Amino acid sequence: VDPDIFNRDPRDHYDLLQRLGGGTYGEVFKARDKVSGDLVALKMVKMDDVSTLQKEILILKTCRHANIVAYHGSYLWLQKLWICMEFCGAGSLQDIYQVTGSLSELQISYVCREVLQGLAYLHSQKKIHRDIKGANILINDAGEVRLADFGISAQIGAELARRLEFIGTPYWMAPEVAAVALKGGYNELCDIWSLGITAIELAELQPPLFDVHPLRVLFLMTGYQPPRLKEKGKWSAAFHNFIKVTLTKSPKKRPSATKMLSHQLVSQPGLNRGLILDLLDKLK
Amino acid sequence: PDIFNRDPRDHYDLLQRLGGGTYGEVFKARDKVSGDLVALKMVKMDVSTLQKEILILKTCRHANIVAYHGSYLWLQKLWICMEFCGAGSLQDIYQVTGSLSELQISYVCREVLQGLAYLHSQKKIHRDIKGANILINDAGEVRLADFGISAQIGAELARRLEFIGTPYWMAPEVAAVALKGGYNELCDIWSLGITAIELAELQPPLFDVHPLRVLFLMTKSGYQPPRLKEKGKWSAAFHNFIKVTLTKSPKKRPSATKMLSHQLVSQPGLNRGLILDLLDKLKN
Numbered sequence: 035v036d037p038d039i040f041n042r043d044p045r046d047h048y049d050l051l052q053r054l055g056g057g058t059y060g061e062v063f064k065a066r067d068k069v070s071g072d073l074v075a076l077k078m079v080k081m082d083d084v085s086t087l088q089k090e091i092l093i094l095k096t097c098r099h100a101n102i103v104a105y106h107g108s109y110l111w112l113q114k115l116w117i118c119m120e121f122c123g124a125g126s127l128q129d130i131y132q133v134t135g136s137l138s139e140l141q142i143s144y145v146c147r148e149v150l151q152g153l154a155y156l157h158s159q160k161k162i163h164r165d166i167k168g169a170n171i172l173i174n175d176a177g178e179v180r181l182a183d184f185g186i187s188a189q190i191g192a193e194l195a196r197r198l199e200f201i202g203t204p205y206w207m208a209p210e211v212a213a214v215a216l217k218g219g220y221n222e223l224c225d226i227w228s229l230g231i232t233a234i235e236l237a238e239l240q241p242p243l244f245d246v247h248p249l250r251v252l253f254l255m256t257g258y259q260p261p262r263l264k265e266k267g268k269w270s271a272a273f274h275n276f277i278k279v280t281l282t283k284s285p286k287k288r289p290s291a292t293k294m295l296s297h298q299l300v301s302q303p304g305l306n307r308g309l310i311l312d313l314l315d316k317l318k
Numbered sequence: 319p320d321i322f323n324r325d326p327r328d329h330y331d332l333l334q335r336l337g338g339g340t341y342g343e344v345f346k347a348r349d350k351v352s353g354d355l356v357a358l359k360m361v362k363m364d365v366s367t368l369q370k371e372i373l374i375l376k377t378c379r380h381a382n383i384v385a386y387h388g389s390y391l392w393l394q395k396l397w398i399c400m401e402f403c404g405a406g407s408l409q410d411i412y413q414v415t416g417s418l419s420e421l422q423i424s425y426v427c428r429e430v431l432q433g434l435a436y437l438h439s440q441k442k443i444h445r446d447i448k449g450a451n452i453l454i455n456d457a458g459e460v461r462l463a464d465f466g467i468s469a470q471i472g473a474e475l476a477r478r479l480e481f482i483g484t485p486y487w488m489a490p491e492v493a494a495v496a497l498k499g500g501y502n503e504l505c506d507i508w509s510l511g512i513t514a515i516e517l518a519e520l521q522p523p524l525f526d527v528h529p530l531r532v533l534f535l536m537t538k539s540g541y542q543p544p545r546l547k548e549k550g551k552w553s554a555a556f557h558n559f560i561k562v563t564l565t566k567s568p569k570k571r572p573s574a575t576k577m578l579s580h581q582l583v584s585q586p587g588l589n590r591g592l593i594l595d596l597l598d599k600l601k602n
């Protein structure tokens with residue numbers, strides 16, 4: 035729900051062209067603007083506590099950065115909410131590497147730079163993505179990089195707000211319990227770790243431990259040694275160092291997104307959309 | 319699975335509404351066959367929370383934890399049958415008798431620590447230690463009650479855990495909060511320290527301060543753990559007990575078993591006779 039919501043059928047302004055797939059929740063459709071012919075992405079969510087959707091919309095609406103999917107408005111019609119966003123012609127990095135195979139170090143370097151620019155902006159607004167992965171990093175026809183799917187971020191923000199509201203009397207509560215109730219058990223630096231895992235996923239086609247049961251992975255991480263790239267000789271010492279510092283086990287010692295932007299791997303002068311246009315030609 | 323699908327009034331006569339807990343209403347009831355009194359908690363009946371609460375009570379076999387006799391499901395009402403505690407809660411008692419003596423508080427703290435050491439040995443956390451949740455029977459015995467908060471937290475943790483998806487990109491601190499929350503069983507030791515102050519002063523510290531502000535006060539780096547108001551009224555052993563149970567850093571906070579060897583609660587003259595004395599004052 036939103037004060038700027040369009041209380042109208044989205045088919046008044048758009049032609050639905052094809053179903054693309056789901057996100058954390060909702061189904062995304064490729065649509066075409068009836069007036070300009072411009073393509074958009076429409077995420078349809080069936081409708082309940084509307085708190086998560088209100089937060090998702092607020093997150094998208096208050097973002098004005100090139101590395102974050104552009105938000106064009108939402109429609110409420112027949113108990114379906116449609117969130118209209120920027121369309122990304124090549125899909126996610128996962129749609130691409132599943133066909134093309136491993137990305138080169140330069141292509142990964144450019145993607146990490148673009149994601150870090152988007153993360154530095156999000157963290158500057160006190161926002162946390164919490165779901166950084168290849169499937170949530172979209173590529174348009176121009177080789178440009180966009181962060182998408184704030185569903186997890188919205189669920190966490192709504193859950194935190196719902197928790198403070200029903201926490202009751204805190205007079206017997208221990209300080210560590212009061213701290214988790216107000217700020218959760220972590221901060222925005224979790225996004226820097228997820229980006230390092232994503233760099234390994236782009237290089238190896240899977241995140242570390244993918245073949246291990248999700249619950250067993252949670253227990254292993256909770257003596258845990260941060261993952262490393264498999265083939266040392268395939269990558270430069272700069273890429274190995276990038277993985278090392280992004281995957282700093284202690285968040286306190288983990289560098290911020292702005293600090294990571296001056297790391298040699300992502301501050302190289304030859305990084306641009308042309309590296310991704312090369313990958314898209316390989317997909318063709 | 320062992321819930322009795324029948325009306326509890328077949329076996330019990332409802333005598334009086336006593337009051338509510340975290341959820342539900344507690345009634346004083348009489349066994350039709352033996353004339354023995356029981357406590358029946360009625361809850362209007364997602365059943366995840368009630369399932370965990372019954373499981374917590376059913377798997378406890380310790381004298382300092384209120385006895386569980388079974389549950390009834392009838393006419394969309396769940397009745398949890400438990401041991402009746404003739405004197406009620408310590409809050410019901412101190413609201414009539416006034417402040418408890420140091421020896422009476424020492425015995426209550428010993429009994430609660432024995433119950434906590436047992437709960438923590440089964441990987442359980444009370445999370446709601448306070449005077450209202452410490453019950454006293456006619457024999458002056460001490461029983462921990464109301465696992466409603468513990469059940470809500472356990473159900474919430476299992477619900478978010480089942481609907482979190484792939485954790486392969488999650489930072490270790492995010493995986494830790496997903497598996498064990500942002501704190502451990504040592505939160506119960508802090509709550510016991512606050513409860514000891516509540517028994518001594520009739521209110522927990524900061525009782526008159528807004529609940530949300532109290533949360534902020536504790537999160538601050540300069541937060542000082544509470545102390546007893548009248549220093550000259552209590553022994554240095556009671557002051558030290560408050561000092562170590564209210565250790566700000568949960569890492570430095572002693573366990574329940576370690577606290578059981580503290581001078582205050584290891585005194586040889588601590589027995590139910592101290593509460594029987596308190597109950598004779600109540601009889602007047």
Ligand SMILES: CC[C@@H](N)c1cc(OC)cc2c1CN(c1cccc(-c3nncn3C(C)C)n1)C2=O
Pocket residue numbers: 054055056057058062075077103119120121122123124125126129169170172182183184
């Ligand atoms: C799952 C379909 C995906 N494989 C795919 C394939 C594709 O092929 C041409 C194009 C697109 C997408 C996604 N997408 C988009 C755009 C804007 C927002 C969102 C978004 N907002 N919330 C969740 N999402 C996405 C991340 C689920 N998505 C596209 O433009």
Ligand SMILES: CC[C@@H](N)c1cc(OC)cc2c1CN(c1cccc(-c3nncn3C(C)C)n1)C2=O
Pocket residue numbers: 336337338339340344357359384400401402403404405406407410450451453463464465
């Ligand atoms: C609110 C009534 C209280 N003032 C009171 C007054 C009283 O007067 C003689 C007797 C009793 C109680 C409580 N109670 C009992 C017993 C067993 C379990 C539970 C229980 N299980 N889950 C939550 N509870 C309670 C703690 C909320 N309660 C008694 O036997």
